[PDB]
Amino acid sequence: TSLDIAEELQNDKGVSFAFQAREEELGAFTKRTLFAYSGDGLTGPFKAPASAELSSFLTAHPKGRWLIAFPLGTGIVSVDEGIMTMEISRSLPEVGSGSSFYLTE
Amino acid sequence: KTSLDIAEELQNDKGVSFAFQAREEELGAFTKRTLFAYSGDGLTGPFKAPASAELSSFLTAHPKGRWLIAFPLGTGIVSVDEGIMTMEISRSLPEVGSGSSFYLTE
Amino acid sequence: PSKTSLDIAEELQNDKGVSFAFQAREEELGAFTKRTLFAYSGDGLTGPFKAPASAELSSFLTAHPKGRWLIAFPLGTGIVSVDEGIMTMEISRSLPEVGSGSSFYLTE
C-alpha cells in the first residue's frame, strides 16, 4: 500500500548511502519519508547522481530540501539536475541511519 | 494490525502549524503507539493548540503521560490537557523539522 | 499485501530492573531490504544495559553489516550488540530517561 523508491548512491570517493523514499496516504493527508543509511563517515557534503525517480521525490518537499537527524549530526539533502547534495552540520565519523518526513493535506 | 492511523493539522494562536500523525499497531502480545510530528515553522517557546478528541485520547494513553520527542535541532515534550496540546521545547528552534516518539507495551 | 516479512517484539530487563521493549522489523522493498530495530524505555540508564535476549532477537541483532546498532535517543546515543544471546547496549552519557529511537540499515 505504501509506495517506495530504494537505491544506493556513491560519491567519487566511494562513500555509499542507501535511501528509501516512501509515500503513504492517510485519508486527506499524504506523508513522504526519506530514510537514509550509511556505514561510512563524511568530512564534507555527500554528492552523487540520483535516479530521476528519487530526484523527483526529493524535489517535492515544501522546503525544497530534507533536514535529517543522524546519531552524530544533522544533514540537509537536496537535488539539482539529478545530483544529490547532502550538506552536514559537522564531519561525521559514521553516518548511521535517520529519517526525515513531511505530511501535507 | 495497524489499528489506528490518524493525521491532523494543529495551529497555535500565532500561526505556527504542525502536522501530527498518531499510529497504533498490534504486534502479537505488544501494542506500539507512535506520534509523528512535522513543522516547517520555527518555535520560540511552547506550542499550544487545540487537538481533536481522538488525538487527545491517543496522547493521554502514554505510560509517562507525555511524549518525549527528538527533532533535528532540539527536543520536545508533547502533552494534552482537556483537548489542548502543549509541546514544550528544550531551546528555541529556528526550524522544527520532523520527528517521532513511540512506546511499546504488553 | 504487506511488505513486512518480520515483526517481533520483546521486553528485556537487566539485573537492576531497568526494562526495555525492542521491536525488530524486516521490510522487503524490492531490490532492497530494510531491517529496523526500535527501542523504548521509560527508565534511565546510568551505564550499559545488559540483558538476555531471545534466540530470534539475537539472530536479528547479529545480522547487521556493522555487527551492532548505532541508535539515537532524545538525550544521547547507544550502541546495541549481542553476544551469546546477551544484549549489551553501551551509551554515550548517563541518560536520566531513555525514551524511544530506532536504528536501521538497507541492503541489496
GROMACS .gro file of C-alpha atoms in nm:
model
  319
    1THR     CA    1   0.000   0.000   0.000
    2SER     CA    2   0.290   0.236   0.072
    3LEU     CA    3   0.493   0.324  -0.235
    4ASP     CA    4   0.873   0.303  -0.211
    5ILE     CA    5   1.179   0.405  -0.414
    6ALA     CA    6   1.504   0.246  -0.288
    7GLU     CA    7   1.856   0.291  -0.424
    8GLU     CA    8   2.224   0.305  -0.335
    9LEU     CA    9   2.423   0.616  -0.426
   10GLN     CA   10   2.802   0.657  -0.426
   11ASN     CA   11   3.023   0.961  -0.442
   12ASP     CA   12   3.352   0.997  -0.626
   13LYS     CA   13   3.545   0.876  -0.317
   14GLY     CA   14   3.340   0.554  -0.279
   15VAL     CA   15   3.125   0.659   0.018
   16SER     CA   16   2.794   0.472  -0.027
   17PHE     CA   17   2.450   0.564   0.102
   18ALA     CA   18   2.126   0.377   0.075
   19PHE     CA   19   1.800   0.572   0.056
   20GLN     CA   20   1.438   0.468   0.077
   21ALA     CA   21   1.178   0.725  -0.025
   22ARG     CA   22   0.829   0.624   0.097
   23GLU     CA   23   0.492   0.777   0.013
   24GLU     CA   24   0.186   0.690   0.230
   25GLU     CA   25  -0.175   0.804   0.222
   26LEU     CA   26  -0.350   0.888   0.547
   27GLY     CA   27  -0.702   0.993   0.449
   28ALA     CA   28  -0.677   1.357   0.346
   29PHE     CA   29  -0.305   1.360   0.432
   30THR     CA   30  -0.003   1.230   0.243
   31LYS     CA   31   0.318   1.151   0.426
   32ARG     CA   32   0.651   1.137   0.243
   33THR     CA   33   0.952   0.996   0.431
   34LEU     CA   34   1.316   0.988   0.331
   35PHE     CA   35   1.514   0.711   0.509
   36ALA     CA   36   1.893   0.731   0.478
   37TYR     CA   37   2.166   0.483   0.579
   38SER     CA   38   2.548   0.481   0.551
   39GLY     CA   39   2.819   0.289   0.736
   40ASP     CA   40   3.077   0.537   0.615
   41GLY     CA   41   3.194   0.873   0.751
   42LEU     CA   42   3.178   1.214   0.572
   43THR     CA   43   3.419   1.508   0.605
   44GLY     CA   44   3.204   1.720   0.388
   45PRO     CA   45   2.893   1.713   0.172
   46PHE     CA   46   2.792   1.392   0.001
   47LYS     CA   47   2.741   1.447  -0.372
   48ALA     CA   48   2.620   1.171  -0.606
   49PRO     CA   49   2.391   1.121  -0.907
   50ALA     CA   50   2.041   1.010  -0.805
   51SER     CA   51   1.771   0.842  -1.015
   52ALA     CA   52   1.512   1.057  -1.183
   53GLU     CA   53   1.251   0.898  -0.955
   54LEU     CA   54   1.440   0.975  -0.630
   55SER     CA   55   1.519   1.326  -0.759
   56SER     CA   56   1.151   1.389  -0.826
   57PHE     CA   57   1.053   1.270  -0.478
   58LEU     CA   58   1.327   1.490  -0.321
   59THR     CA   59   1.215   1.799  -0.512
   60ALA     CA   60   0.853   1.770  -0.387
   61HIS     CA   61   0.928   1.871  -0.026
   62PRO     CA   62   0.762   2.204   0.074
   63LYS     CA   63   1.101   2.334   0.193
   64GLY     CA   64   1.277   2.215  -0.123
   65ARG     CA   65   1.515   2.001   0.083
   66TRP     CA   66   1.520   1.744   0.367
   67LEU     CA   67   1.654   1.834   0.713
   68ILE     CA   68   1.755   1.496   0.857
   69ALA     CA   69   1.888   1.392   1.201
   70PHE     CA   70   2.153   1.124   1.228
   71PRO     CA   71   2.301   0.995   1.555
   72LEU     CA   72   2.614   1.217   1.537
   73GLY     CA   73   2.497   1.521   1.338
   74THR     CA   74   2.242   1.682   1.107
   75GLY     CA   75   2.215   1.668   0.724
   76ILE     CA   76   2.021   1.859   0.460
   77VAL     CA   77   1.951   1.661   0.145
   78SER     CA   78   1.875   1.843  -0.180
   79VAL     CA   79   1.886   1.766  -0.550
   80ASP     CA   80   1.978   1.973  -0.853
   81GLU     CA   81   1.961   1.828  -1.208
   82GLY     CA   82   1.969   1.473  -1.079
   83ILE     CA   83   2.267   1.525  -0.848
   84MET     CA   84   2.205   1.483  -0.474
   85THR     CA   85   2.392   1.702  -0.232
   86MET     CA   86   2.371   1.624   0.141
   87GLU     CA   87   2.533   1.902   0.341
   88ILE     CA   88   2.627   1.816   0.702
   89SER     CA   89   2.645   2.013   1.027
   90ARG     CA   90   2.975   1.859   1.132
   91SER     CA   91   3.207   1.595   0.999
   92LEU     CA   92   3.057   1.254   1.077
   93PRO     CA   93   3.290   0.970   1.172
   94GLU     CA   94   2.996   0.739   1.098
   95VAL     CA   95   2.668   0.847   0.941
   96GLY     CA   96   2.435   0.570   1.066
   97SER     CA   97   2.063   0.593   0.991
   98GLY     CA   98   1.795   0.859   1.011
   99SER     CA   99   1.474   0.978   0.852
  100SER     CA  100   1.301   1.300   0.759
  101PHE     CA  101   0.933   1.333   0.660
  102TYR     CA  102   0.657   1.580   0.595
  103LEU     CA  103   0.281   1.550   0.587
  104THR     CA  104   0.055   1.763   0.382
  105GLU     CA  105  -0.320   1.793   0.325
  106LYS     CA  106  -0.254  -0.490   1.263
  107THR     CA  107  -0.236  -0.113   1.215
  108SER     CA  108  -0.541  -0.048   1.436
  109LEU     CA  109  -0.538   0.335   1.414
  110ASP     CA  110  -0.367   0.580   1.179
  111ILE     CA  111  -0.492   0.939   1.212
  112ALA     CA  112  -0.347   1.265   1.097
  113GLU     CA  113  -0.439   1.621   1.186
  114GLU     CA  114  -0.302   1.975   1.132
  115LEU     CA  115  -0.275   2.186   1.451
  116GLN     CA  116  -0.206   2.555   1.474
  117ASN     CA  117  -0.129   2.784   1.766
  118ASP     CA  118  -0.260   3.140   1.813
  119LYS     CA  119   0.037   3.290   1.621
  120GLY     CA  120   0.013   3.081   1.307
  121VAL     CA  121   0.275   2.814   1.375
  122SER     CA  122   0.136   2.492   1.229
  123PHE     CA  123   0.225   2.125   1.283
  124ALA     CA  124   0.106   1.809   1.116
  125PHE     CA  125   0.067   1.518   1.359
  126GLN     CA  126   0.011   1.151   1.284
  127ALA     CA  127  -0.087   0.904   1.553
  128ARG     CA  128  -0.038   0.534   1.472
  129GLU     CA  129  -0.133   0.233   1.675
  130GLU     CA  130  -0.004  -0.113   1.580
  131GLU     CA  131  -0.060  -0.460   1.721
  132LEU     CA  132   0.250  -0.678   1.736
  133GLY     CA  133   0.144  -1.008   1.889
  134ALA     CA  134   0.146  -0.955   2.265
  135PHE     CA  135   0.265  -0.594   2.219
  136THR     CA  136   0.097  -0.275   2.113
  137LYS     CA  137   0.303   0.009   1.969
  138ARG     CA  138   0.184   0.367   1.964
  139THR     CA  139   0.378   0.624   1.758
  140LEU     CA  140   0.337   1.001   1.742
  141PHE     CA  141   0.487   1.161   1.431
  142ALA     CA  142   0.530   1.542   1.422
  143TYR     CA  143   0.626   1.780   1.138
  144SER     CA  144   0.652   2.155   1.111
  145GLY     CA  145   0.823   2.380   0.860
  146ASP     CA  146   0.799   2.666   1.108
  147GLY     CA  147   1.020   2.775   1.393
  148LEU     CA  148   0.919   2.786   1.760
  149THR     CA  149   1.034   3.041   2.006
  150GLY     CA  150   0.856   2.883   2.305
  151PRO     CA  151   0.594   2.616   2.381
  152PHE     CA  152   0.347   2.521   2.107
  153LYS     CA  153  -0.012   2.527   2.237
  154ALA     CA  154  -0.301   2.427   2.010
  155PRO     CA  155  -0.644   2.261   2.022
  156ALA     CA  156  -0.645   1.893   1.922
  157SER     CA  157  -0.927   1.661   1.818
  158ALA     CA  158  -1.088   1.442   2.079
  159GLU     CA  159  -0.941   1.137   1.904
  160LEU     CA  160  -0.585   1.271   1.901
  161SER     CA  161  -0.623   1.389   2.259
  162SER     CA  162  -0.729   1.039   2.369
  163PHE     CA  163  -0.425   0.894   2.194
  164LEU     CA  164  -0.188   1.147   2.357
  165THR     CA  165  -0.323   1.074   2.707
  166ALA     CA  166  -0.258   0.695   2.681
  167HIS     CA  167   0.122   0.712   2.715
  168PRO     CA  168   0.267   0.548   3.033
  169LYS     CA  169   0.465   0.865   3.106
  170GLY     CA  170   0.164   1.088   3.038
  171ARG     CA  171   0.355   1.281   2.772
  172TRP     CA  172   0.571   1.220   2.466
  173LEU     CA  173   0.944   1.298   2.467
  174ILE     CA  174   1.032   1.367   2.104
  175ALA     CA  175   1.361   1.437   1.925
  176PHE     CA  176   1.378   1.687   1.640
  177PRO     CA  177   1.690   1.769   1.443
  178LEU     CA  178   1.775   2.087   1.637
  179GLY     CA  179   1.623   2.016   1.981
  180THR     CA  180   1.387   1.814   2.198
  181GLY     CA  181   1.015   1.847   2.274
  182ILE     CA  182   0.769   1.705   2.523
  183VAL     CA  183   0.412   1.677   2.395
  184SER     CA  184   0.122   1.660   2.637
  185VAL     CA  185  -0.253   1.725   2.630
  186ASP     CA  186  -0.500   1.869   2.884
  187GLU     CA  187  -0.872   1.882   2.802
  188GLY     CA  188  -0.814   1.891   2.429
  189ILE     CA  189  -0.530   2.147   2.435
  190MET     CA  190  -0.186   2.014   2.326
  191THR     CA  191   0.122   2.173   2.477
  192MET     CA  192   0.464   2.091   2.334
  193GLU     CA  193   0.740   2.235   2.550
  194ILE     CA  194   1.084   2.269   2.386
  195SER     CA  195   1.445   2.243   2.503
  196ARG     CA  196   1.566   2.551   2.309
  197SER     CA  197   1.424   2.799   2.067
  198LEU     CA  198   1.406   2.630   1.722
  199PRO     CA  199   1.459   2.831   1.405
  200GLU     CA  200   1.302   2.535   1.227
  201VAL     CA  201   1.130   2.235   1.386
  202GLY     CA  202   1.152   1.969   1.111
  203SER     CA  203   1.022   1.618   1.179
  204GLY     CA  204   1.050   1.355   1.448
  205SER     CA  205   0.870   1.073   1.622
  206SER     CA  206   0.813   0.931   1.968
  207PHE     CA  207   0.676   0.582   2.043
  208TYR     CA  208   0.630   0.330   2.313
  209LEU     CA  209   0.564  -0.042   2.324
  210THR     CA  210   0.360  -0.209   2.594
  211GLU     CA  211   0.225  -0.554   2.676
  212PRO     CA  212  -0.029  -0.720   0.056
  213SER     CA  213   0.222  -0.618   0.329
  214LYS     CA  214   0.594  -0.552   0.272
  215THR     CA  215   0.667  -0.659   0.631
  216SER     CA  216   0.834  -1.001   0.641
  217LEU     CA  217   0.931  -1.000   1.011
  218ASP     CA  218   0.787  -0.806   1.302
  219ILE     CA  219   0.874  -0.921   1.652
  220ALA     CA  220   0.875  -0.760   1.992
  221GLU     CA  221   1.005  -0.846   2.335
  222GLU     CA  222   1.078  -0.694   2.674
  223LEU     CA  223   1.430  -0.721   2.819
  224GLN     CA  224   1.527  -0.647   3.176
  225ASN     CA  225   1.867  -0.605   3.341
  226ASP     CA  226   1.971  -0.718   3.693
  227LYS     CA  227   1.867  -0.378   3.832
  228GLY     CA  228   1.514  -0.398   3.689
  229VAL     CA  229   1.564  -0.141   3.411
  230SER     CA  230   1.335  -0.259   3.131
  231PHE     CA  231   1.333  -0.201   2.758
  232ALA     CA  232   1.099  -0.303   2.486
  233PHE     CA  233   1.255  -0.388   2.149
  234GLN     CA  234   1.089  -0.442   1.812
  235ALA     CA  235   1.278  -0.599   1.522
  236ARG     CA  236   1.124  -0.541   1.180
  237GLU     CA  237   1.221  -0.657   0.831
  238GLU     CA  238   1.063  -0.488   0.526
  239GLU     CA  239   1.103  -0.612   0.172
  240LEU     CA  240   1.130  -0.314  -0.066
  241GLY     CA  241   1.206  -0.495  -0.390
  242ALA     CA  242   1.577  -0.497  -0.468
  243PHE     CA  243   1.637  -0.365  -0.115
  244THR     CA  244   1.550  -0.495   0.226
  245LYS     CA  245   1.530  -0.274   0.534
  246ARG     CA  246   1.592  -0.407   0.883
  247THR     CA  247   1.496  -0.179   1.175
  248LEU     CA  248   1.550  -0.208   1.549
  249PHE     CA  249   1.308   0.002   1.758
  250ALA     CA  250   1.391   0.054   2.128
  251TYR     CA  251   1.183   0.207   2.411
  252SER     CA  252   1.238   0.253   2.783
  253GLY     CA  253   1.075   0.482   3.036
  254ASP     CA  254   1.372   0.425   3.264
  255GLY     CA  255   1.703   0.598   3.292
  256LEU     CA  256   2.036   0.427   3.237
  257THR     CA  257   2.350   0.504   3.423
  258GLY     CA  258   2.571   0.270   3.222
  259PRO     CA  259   2.548  -0.013   2.970
  260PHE     CA  260   2.227  -0.212   2.965
  261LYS     CA  261   2.286  -0.589   2.969
  262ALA     CA  262   2.004  -0.842   2.942
  263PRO     CA  263   1.933  -1.181   2.792
  264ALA     CA  264   1.763  -1.177   2.452
  265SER     CA  265   1.562  -1.443   2.267
  266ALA     CA  266   1.730  -1.659   2.003
  267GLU     CA  267   1.523  -1.483   1.735
  268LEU     CA  268   1.613  -1.132   1.851
  269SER     CA  269   1.976  -1.232   1.891
  270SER     CA  270   1.989  -1.361   1.533
  271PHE     CA  271   1.835  -1.035   1.411
  272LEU     CA  272   2.085  -0.826   1.612
  273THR     CA  273   2.382  -1.018   1.478
  274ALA     CA  274   2.294  -0.973   1.109
  275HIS     CA  275   2.387  -0.603   1.083
  276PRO     CA  276   2.674  -0.516   0.849
  277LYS     CA  277   2.846  -0.328   1.135
  278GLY     CA  278   2.782  -0.612   1.382
  279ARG     CA  279   2.599  -0.366   1.610
  280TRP     CA  280   2.327  -0.097   1.601
  281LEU     CA  281   2.412   0.272   1.648
  282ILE     CA  282   2.090   0.427   1.783
  283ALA     CA  283   1.986   0.783   1.864
  284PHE     CA  284   1.767   0.859   2.162
  285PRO     CA  285   1.644   1.205   2.259
  286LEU     CA  286   1.916   1.262   2.521
  287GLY     CA  287   2.208   1.053   2.395
  288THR     CA  288   2.335   0.772   2.173
  289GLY     CA  289   2.352   0.395   2.219
  290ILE     CA  290   2.521   0.101   2.051
  291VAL     CA  291   2.330  -0.227   2.071
  292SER     CA  292   2.516  -0.558   2.028
  293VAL     CA  293   2.459  -0.922   2.121
  294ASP     CA  294   2.700  -1.194   2.231
  295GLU     CA  295   2.586  -1.548   2.309
  296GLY     CA  296   2.225  -1.426   2.348
  297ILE     CA  297   2.314  -1.144   2.589
  298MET     CA  298   2.236  -0.790   2.465
  299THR     CA  299   2.468  -0.508   2.561
  300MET     CA  300   2.366  -0.150   2.487
  301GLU     CA  301   2.651   0.093   2.557
  302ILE     CA  302   2.561   0.460   2.598
  303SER     CA  303   2.733   0.788   2.522
  304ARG     CA  304   2.637   0.958   2.851
  305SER     CA  305   2.423   0.872   3.151
  306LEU     CA  306   2.056   0.909   3.049
  307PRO     CA  307   1.809   1.031   3.306
  308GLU     CA  308   1.544   0.893   3.071
  309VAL     CA  309   1.598   0.680   2.760
  310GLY     CA  310   1.277   0.738   2.561
  311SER     CA  311   1.248   0.590   2.212
  312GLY     CA  312   1.458   0.562   1.898
  313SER     CA  313   1.532   0.341   1.603
  314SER     CA  314   1.827   0.216   1.404
  315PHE     CA  315   1.806   0.061   1.054
  316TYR     CA  316   2.003  -0.046   0.758
  317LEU     CA  317   1.919  -0.106   0.394
  318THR     CA  318   2.079  -0.385   0.196
  319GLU     CA  319   2.063  -0.505  -0.168
   0.00000   0.00000   0.00000
